[PDB]
Amino acid sequence: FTVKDCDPNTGEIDEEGYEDEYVLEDLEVTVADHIQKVMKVNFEAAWDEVGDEFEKEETFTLSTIKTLEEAVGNIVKFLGMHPCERSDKVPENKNTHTLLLAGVFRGGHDILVRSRLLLLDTVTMQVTARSSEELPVDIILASVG
Amino acid sequence: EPAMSMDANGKIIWAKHSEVQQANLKAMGDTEIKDGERLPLAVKDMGSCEIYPQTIQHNPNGRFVVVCGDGEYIIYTAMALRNKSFGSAQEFAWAHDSSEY
């Protein structure tokens, strides 16, 4: 900006004044500015289907902590989607969990996620992102973080 | 020295003169001239602290200065002319990053 001084009493607004620039804050763009979180038009089918065309994967095996919760903090909250297919709920503890989760991404097509969190007693887990849009499968796996 | 630190826009804001009030900081200038030859300043004080310093150090982005004097540290929010913060020292490091100390 070109920075101009004020008199608030009665001012002056004149062509001159000199610039300095100040660095502003980052904008990060989310996976929730774009999405409508949903319930499926056809989960059974869709669920699978989305796999069919779309599916990328990441696996981790969890050996120092046996808790979802960290993961959980990043996922419900980052994606802004619904955990489910009756596979959401956990009390202050729970043995196993799946979020098979929903919403639709911008540009029309959908971004779909299944997270099977598996507890043997370590957690090893299958995160699936399946999508009706290509950019989202790679994204979900990242974005969730 | 006085206590001053310069924003790379081009304002070395110092304070005081030698024992004058701190009331005097500023300098964005406005003009250009030859290497050997000499230059003009702007005029618009801010400040009129009390504590008498001997350190000025800019924030790592010039920005937040922490100034120590009388043995305590006033940090200023500078443009703000706000006290960014204060306490008593002994010795210092900014976490260079520009976010801790």
Q: Does A1 touch chain B (CB under 8 A)?
A: no
- Amino acid code (one letter) for B91: E
| Alpha-carbon distance B9 to nearest alpha carbon in chain A (angstroms) | 6
Taking 3-state DSSP, the helix, strand and coil percentages for chain A, each rounded to the nearest 5, stand at 25, 30, 50
Contact B9 A23 (CB under 8 A): no
Rg (CA), chain A: 23
- Amino acid code (one letter) for A62: L
- Three-state secondary-structure class, residue A77: helix
Q: Which of B12, B28, B45 to mutate to test the interface with A (most CBs of A within 10 A)?
A: B28
> Which token pair is A10?
């009665």
Query: How far apart (Å, rounded) are the C-alpha atoms in residues B99 and B94?
Result: 7
Q: Does A20 touch chain B (CB under 8 A)?
A: yes
- Nearest by CB to B30, which of A18, A20, A23? A18
Nearest residue of chain B to residue A18 (CA atoms): B30
Task: State the pairing for strand pair A18-19/B72-77.
Answer: unpaired
Helix A69-79 vs helix A134-144: crossing angle, to nearest 10 = 130
Resolution at which this structure was determined, Å:
15.0
Under 8 Å between Cβ of A132 and A50 = yes
> Which token pair is B93?
């490091």
